[PDB]
Coordinates of C-alpha atoms and ligand atoms in Angstrom, one line a residue:
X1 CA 19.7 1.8 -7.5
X2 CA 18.0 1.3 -4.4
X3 CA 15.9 -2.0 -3.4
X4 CA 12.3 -1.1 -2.0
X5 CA 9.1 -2.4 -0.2
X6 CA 5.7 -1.5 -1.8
X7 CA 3.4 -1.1 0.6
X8 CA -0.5 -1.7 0.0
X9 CA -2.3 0.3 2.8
X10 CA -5.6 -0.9 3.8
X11 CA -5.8 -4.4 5.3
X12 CA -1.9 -4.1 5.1
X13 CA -0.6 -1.0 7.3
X14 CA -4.2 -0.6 8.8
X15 CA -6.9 -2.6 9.2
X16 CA -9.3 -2.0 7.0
X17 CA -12.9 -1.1 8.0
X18 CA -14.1 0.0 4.4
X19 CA -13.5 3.6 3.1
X20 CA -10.8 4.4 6.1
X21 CA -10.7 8.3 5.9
X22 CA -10.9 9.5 9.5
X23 CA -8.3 9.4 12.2
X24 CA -10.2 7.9 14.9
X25 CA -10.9 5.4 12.5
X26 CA -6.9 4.8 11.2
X27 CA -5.9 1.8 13.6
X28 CA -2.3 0.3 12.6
X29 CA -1.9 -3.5 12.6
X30 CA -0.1 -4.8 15.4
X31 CA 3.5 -5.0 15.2
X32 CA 3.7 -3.2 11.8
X33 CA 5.1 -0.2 12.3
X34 CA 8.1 -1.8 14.0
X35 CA 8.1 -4.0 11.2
X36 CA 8.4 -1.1 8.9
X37 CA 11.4 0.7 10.9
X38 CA 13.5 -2.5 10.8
X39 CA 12.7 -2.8 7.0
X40 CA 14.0 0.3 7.0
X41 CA 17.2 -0.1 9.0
X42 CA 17.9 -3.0 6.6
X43 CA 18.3 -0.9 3.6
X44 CA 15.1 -0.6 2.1
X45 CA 13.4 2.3 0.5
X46 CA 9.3 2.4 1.5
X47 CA 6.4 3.3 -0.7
X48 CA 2.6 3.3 -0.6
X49 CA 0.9 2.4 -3.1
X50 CA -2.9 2.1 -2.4
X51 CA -6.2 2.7 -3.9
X52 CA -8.7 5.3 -2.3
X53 CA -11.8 4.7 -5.0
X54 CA -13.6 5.7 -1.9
X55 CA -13.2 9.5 -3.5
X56 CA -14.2 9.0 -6.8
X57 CA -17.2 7.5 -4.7
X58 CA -18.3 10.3 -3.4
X59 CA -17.3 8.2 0.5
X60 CA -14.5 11.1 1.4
X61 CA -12.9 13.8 0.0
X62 CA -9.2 13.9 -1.9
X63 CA -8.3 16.3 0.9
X64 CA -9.8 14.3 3.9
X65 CA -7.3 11.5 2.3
X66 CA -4.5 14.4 2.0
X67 CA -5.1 15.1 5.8
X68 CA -5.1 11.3 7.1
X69 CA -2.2 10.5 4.8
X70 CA 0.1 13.7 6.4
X71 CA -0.9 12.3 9.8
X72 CA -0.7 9.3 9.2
X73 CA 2.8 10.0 7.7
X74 CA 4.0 12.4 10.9
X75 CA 2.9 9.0 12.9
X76 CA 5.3 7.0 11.1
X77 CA 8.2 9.9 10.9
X78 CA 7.7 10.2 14.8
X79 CA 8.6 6.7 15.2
X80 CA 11.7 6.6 13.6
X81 CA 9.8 5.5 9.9
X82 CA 10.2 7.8 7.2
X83 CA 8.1 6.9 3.9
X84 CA 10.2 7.7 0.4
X85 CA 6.9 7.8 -1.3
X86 CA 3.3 7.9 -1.1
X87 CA 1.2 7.0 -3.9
X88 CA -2.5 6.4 -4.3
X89 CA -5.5 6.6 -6.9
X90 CA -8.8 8.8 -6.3
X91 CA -10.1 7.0 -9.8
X92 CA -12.9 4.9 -10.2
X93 CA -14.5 4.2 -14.1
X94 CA -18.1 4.4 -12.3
X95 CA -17.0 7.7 -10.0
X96 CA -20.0 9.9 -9.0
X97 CA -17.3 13.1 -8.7
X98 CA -17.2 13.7 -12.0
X99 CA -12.7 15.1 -12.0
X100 CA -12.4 11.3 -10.3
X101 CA -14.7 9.6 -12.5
X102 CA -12.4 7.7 -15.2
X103 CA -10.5 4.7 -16.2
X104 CA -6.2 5.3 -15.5
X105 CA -3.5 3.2 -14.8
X106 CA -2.4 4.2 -11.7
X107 CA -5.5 2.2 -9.9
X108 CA -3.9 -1.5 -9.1
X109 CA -3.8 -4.1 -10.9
X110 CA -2.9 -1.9 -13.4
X111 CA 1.0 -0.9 -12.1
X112 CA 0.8 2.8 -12.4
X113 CA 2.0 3.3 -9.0
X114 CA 4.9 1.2 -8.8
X115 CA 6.3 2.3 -12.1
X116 CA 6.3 6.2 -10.8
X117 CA 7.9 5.3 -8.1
X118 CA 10.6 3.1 -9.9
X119 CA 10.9 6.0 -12.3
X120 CA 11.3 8.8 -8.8
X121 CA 13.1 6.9 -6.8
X122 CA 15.4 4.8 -9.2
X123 CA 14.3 1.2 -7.7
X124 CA 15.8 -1.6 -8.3
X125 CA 12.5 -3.5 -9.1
X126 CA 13.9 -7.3 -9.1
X127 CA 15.5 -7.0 -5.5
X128 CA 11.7 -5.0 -4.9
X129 CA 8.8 -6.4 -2.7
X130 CA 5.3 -5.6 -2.7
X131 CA 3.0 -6.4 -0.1
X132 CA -0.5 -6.4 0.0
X133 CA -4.0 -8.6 0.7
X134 CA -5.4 -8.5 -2.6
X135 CA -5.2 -10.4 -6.2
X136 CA -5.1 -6.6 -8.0
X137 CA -1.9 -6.4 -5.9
X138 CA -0.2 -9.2 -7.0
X139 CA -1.3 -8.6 -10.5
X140 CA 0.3 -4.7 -10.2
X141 CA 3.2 -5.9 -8.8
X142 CA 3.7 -8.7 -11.9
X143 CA 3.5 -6.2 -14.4
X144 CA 5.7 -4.0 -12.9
X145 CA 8.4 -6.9 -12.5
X146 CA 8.3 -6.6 -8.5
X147 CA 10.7 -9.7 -7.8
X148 CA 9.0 -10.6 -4.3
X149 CA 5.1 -11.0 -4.2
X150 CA 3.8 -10.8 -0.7
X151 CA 0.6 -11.5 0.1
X152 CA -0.7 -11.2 3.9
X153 CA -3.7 -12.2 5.9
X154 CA -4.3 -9.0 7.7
X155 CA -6.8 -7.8 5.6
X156 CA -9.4 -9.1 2.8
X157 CA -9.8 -13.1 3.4
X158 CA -7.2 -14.2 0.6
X159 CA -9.1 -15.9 -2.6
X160 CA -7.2 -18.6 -4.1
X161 CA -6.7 -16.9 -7.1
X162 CA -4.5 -14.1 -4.7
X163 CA -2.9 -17.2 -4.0
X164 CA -2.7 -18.4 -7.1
X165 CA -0.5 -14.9 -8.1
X166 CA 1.8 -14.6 -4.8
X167 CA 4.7 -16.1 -4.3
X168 CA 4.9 -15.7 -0.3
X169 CA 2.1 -15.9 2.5
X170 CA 2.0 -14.1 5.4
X171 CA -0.1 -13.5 8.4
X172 CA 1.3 -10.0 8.5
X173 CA 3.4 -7.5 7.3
X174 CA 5.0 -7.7 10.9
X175 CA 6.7 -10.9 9.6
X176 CA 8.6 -9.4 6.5
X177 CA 11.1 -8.5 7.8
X178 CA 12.2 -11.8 9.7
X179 CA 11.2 -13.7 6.1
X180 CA 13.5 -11.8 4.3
X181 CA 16.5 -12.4 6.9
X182 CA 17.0 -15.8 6.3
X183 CA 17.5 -15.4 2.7
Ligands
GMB1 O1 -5.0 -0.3 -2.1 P1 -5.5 -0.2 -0.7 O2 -5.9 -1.6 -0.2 O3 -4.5 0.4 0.3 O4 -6.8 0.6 -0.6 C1 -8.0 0.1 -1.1 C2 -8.9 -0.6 -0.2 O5 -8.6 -2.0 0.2 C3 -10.4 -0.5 -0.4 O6 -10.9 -1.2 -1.5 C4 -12.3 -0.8 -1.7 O7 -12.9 -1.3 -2.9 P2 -12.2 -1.3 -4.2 O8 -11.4 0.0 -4.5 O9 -11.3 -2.5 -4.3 O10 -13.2 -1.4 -5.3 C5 -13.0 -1.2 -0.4 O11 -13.3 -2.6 -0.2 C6 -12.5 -0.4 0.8 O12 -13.2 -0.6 2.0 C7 -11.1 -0.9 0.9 O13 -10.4 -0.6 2.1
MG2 MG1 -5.5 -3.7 0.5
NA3 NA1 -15.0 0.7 -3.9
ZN4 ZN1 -5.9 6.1 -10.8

């Protein structure tokens, strides 16, 4: 039973800029990446876990995510970080594509997400992080008994009530692994 590190992706692995769906426009967060290989060196298993409401919006298509993702995931693999799971929601309740447009419980902070990947990947969810910049991360992760609740500053301002739900604050996912090291 294997110990992992949800990953929320925009404002998290790359900055976000709103709707992120394009290469040119996919710029990781300093240090991150290096962050992520070290994470994985020290035994843990990494998934994704992000919401892409941007194509139930009409912003992008599923398969313009499918193609940034798979580059986005050779990136990573070429660097010696190789993702155990990607997940992410097209859904939005308000969608204008209509085979998007619904309510689900895969789209944070309902933890769809996290428990598919706990269910695929046999995690052991207590000794389990997830990091992200929002409340409806924090809120996934609590429902889906995530042990570790990291919020970071990379991305959306943090609202107290983000705050409120985390249990640590970082400027950066580039810190994790160093915050986890000593204890
Ligand atoms: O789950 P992760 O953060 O990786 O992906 C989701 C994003 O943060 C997106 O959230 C969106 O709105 P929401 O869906 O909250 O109504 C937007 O603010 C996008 O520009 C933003 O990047
Ligand atoms: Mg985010
Ligand atoms: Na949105
Ligand atoms: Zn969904």
């Amino acid at each position: 039973s294997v110990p992992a590190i949800f990953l929320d992706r925009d404002g998290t692995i790359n900055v976000d800029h709103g709707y992120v769906h394009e290469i040119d426009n996919f710029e990781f967060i300093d240090g991150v990446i290096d962050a992520m290989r070290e994470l994985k060196k020290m035994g843990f298993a990494l998934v994704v876990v992000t919401n892409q409401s941007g194509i139930a919006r009409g912003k992008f298509t599923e398969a313009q995510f499918e193609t940034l993702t798979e580059w986005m995931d050779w990136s990573l693999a070429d660097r010696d970080v190789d993702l155990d799971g990607i997940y992410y929601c097209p859904h939005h309740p308000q969608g204008s594509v209509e085979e998007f447009r619904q309510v689900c419980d895969c789209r944070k902070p309902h933890p769809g997400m996290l428990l598919s990947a706990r269910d695929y990947l046999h995690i052991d969810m207590a000794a389990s992080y997830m990091v992200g910049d929002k409340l409806e991360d924090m809120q996934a992760a609590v429902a889906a008994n995530v042990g570790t609740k990291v919020l970071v500053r990379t991305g959306k301002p943090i609202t107290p009530e983000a705050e409120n739900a985390a249990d640590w604050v970082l400027n950066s996912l580039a810190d994790l692994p160093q915050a986890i090291k000593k204890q």
